[PDB]
């Protein structure tokens, strides 16, 4: 839970500048969106990008906290798994 819940807070002071909106050629874009539109990624076009887009079964913000918690829960499962995997990895057995 700590690992997931802290991830967005630990990053929001850095990216938040780039989330102020902009009326660019008629359309609302964040500055982050502007960066993507501007600095041409020839081999990484827009649809490849997997960001949130909304649902009819969804409520908007909050979307970040709800995701952070889900990440926290899956993160404990990943942790159990990866502790045992690590114990396995730290093994002095010979063959």
């Amino acid at each position: 839970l700590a690992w997931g819940l802290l991830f967005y807070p630990g990053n929001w002071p850095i990216i938040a500048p780039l989330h102020v909106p902009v009326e660019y050629n008629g359309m609302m874009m964040t500055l982050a969106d502007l960066q993507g539109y501007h600095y041409v990624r020839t081999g990484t076009p827009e649809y490849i990008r997997m960001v949130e887009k909304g649902t009819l079964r969804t409520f908007g913000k909050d979307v970040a906290p709800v995701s952070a918690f889900f990440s926290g829960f899956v993160s404990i499962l990943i942790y159990f798994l990866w502790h045992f995997f690590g114990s396995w990895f730290g093994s002095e057995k010979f063959v």
């Binding site: 909106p21 902009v22 660019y24 050629n25 501007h38 600095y39 020839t42 949130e52 909304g54």
Partner: protein
């Protein structure tokens, strides 16, 4: 660069780029330029190329040597991915603003999800100056007027250097003492609690509580210096308008087409029928962005890239005028070096020997009306 390697029939049977215009071909850092034109989405789109329900109008350049200040299809800004539809003809403009000096082969292009990069024709464009001149001003909806080429860069370098050094700290708090062999012995020997002392024990609680504190406050201090933020804007733009176009003044039928292997030329037999009010002559055959021109009818006013320009390339057997009514079977021959440079002649290796392209007719007034051809393309061998 890069499209000579793609299957020839793909490039013929996919998107047709025509009437391109480049508003400059030398430019200074911050001076913008404009590529605009039309493209056709060939209704016989290959099987193994997903129909372009989700496509994106990119430009091909090695890194952002330009920035894409704008791009439009149908007079709509298209920063997101669009839906195009088989059969339709679209017009486009991209507004490039220069950034990095050099000699750049700029391609306009169309990424098709589930398809690949569909690469339009490129013309060399030269940027001069020093890239340090580059400036990318934006007026935000809170305005505030920023430069997006450096905005928030002192915050990233700040916060990343802090947390990294905060980490290096934790690691040097301990690597002060001996790390491995003595701690090993200590643990094996039953004495593992001897190695976490109570100073240790909540020097730890400092870093913990500190990191949480430095998070929660600077969190709260960020939703103050920027009290209005919106989530990234994302999602496919379906309703993209096209031209639906005057349905052809001239009605062309490819009764047969062929090419000599090896060879630098393609030969069609067209039966042509003028249904306009004036007379027409065959100006141009345009396949895979190569423009085969009959010099006695058309001169290129657009500075088409010369490696795709065949200025005296199209050789029409009997290219007399053609008044309303009246049908005539003709013998066309499209020859030029582009046919081997750009490996259209490599169609001999493709698993679908069929072609498609544009035909341009001009009346004596000067109006070009455009017609589209596609049929098999049978090879001939000595």
């Amino acid at each position: 660069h890069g499209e000579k390697s793609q299957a020839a029939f793909m490039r013929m049977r996919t998107i047709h780029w025509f009437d391109l215009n480049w508003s400059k071909d030398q430019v200074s850092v911050n001076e913008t330029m404009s590529i605009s034109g039309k493209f056709h989405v060939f209704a016989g789109w290959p099987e193994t190329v997903d129909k372009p329900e989700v496509a994106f109008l990119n430009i091909g350049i090695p890194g952002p040597v330009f920035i894409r200040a704008g791009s439009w299809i149908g007079g709509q800004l298209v920063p997101r991915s669009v839906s195009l539809e088989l059969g339709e003809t679209y017009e486009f403009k991209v507004l490039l603003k220069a950034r990095r000096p050099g000699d750049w082969h700029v391609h306009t292009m169309m990424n098709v999800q589930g398809g690949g990069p569909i690469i339009g024709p490129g013309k060399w464009v030269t940027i001069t100056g020093s890239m340090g001149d580059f400036k990318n001003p934006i007026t935000t909806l809170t305005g505030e007027t920023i430069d997006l080429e450096t905005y928030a860069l002192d915050g990233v370098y700040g916060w990343h250097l802090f947390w990294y050094l905060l980490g290096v700290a934790w690691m040097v708090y301990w690597c002060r003492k001996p790390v491995f062999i003595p701690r090993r012995i200590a643990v094996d020997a039953g004495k593992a609690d001897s190695l976490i002392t109570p100073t240790d024990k909540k020097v730890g609680m400092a870093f913990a509580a500190g990191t949480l504190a430095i998070v929660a406050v600077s969190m709260g201090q960020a939703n103050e210096k920027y009290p209005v933020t919106t989530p990234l804007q994302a999602g496919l733009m379906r309703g993209i308008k096209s031209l639906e176009l005057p349905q052809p003044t001239v009605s062309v039928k490819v009764v047969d087409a062929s090419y000599r292997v090896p060879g630098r030329a393609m030969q069609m037999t067209l039966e042509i029928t003028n249904n306009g009010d004036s007379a027409v002559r065959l100006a141009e055959f345009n396949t895979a962005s190569v423009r085969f021109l009959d010099a006695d009818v058309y001169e290129d006013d657009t500075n088409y890239p010369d490696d795709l320009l065949a200025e005296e390339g199209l050789s029409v057997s009997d290219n007399s005028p053609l008044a309303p009514g009246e049908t005539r079977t003709v013998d066309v021959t499209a020859s030029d070096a582009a046919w081997e440079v750009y490996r259209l002649a490599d169609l001999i290796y493709d698993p679908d020997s069929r072609f498609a392209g544009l035909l341009f007719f001009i009346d004596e007034d000067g109006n070009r009306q455009m017609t589209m051809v596609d049929a098999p393309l049978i090879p001939t061998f000595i």
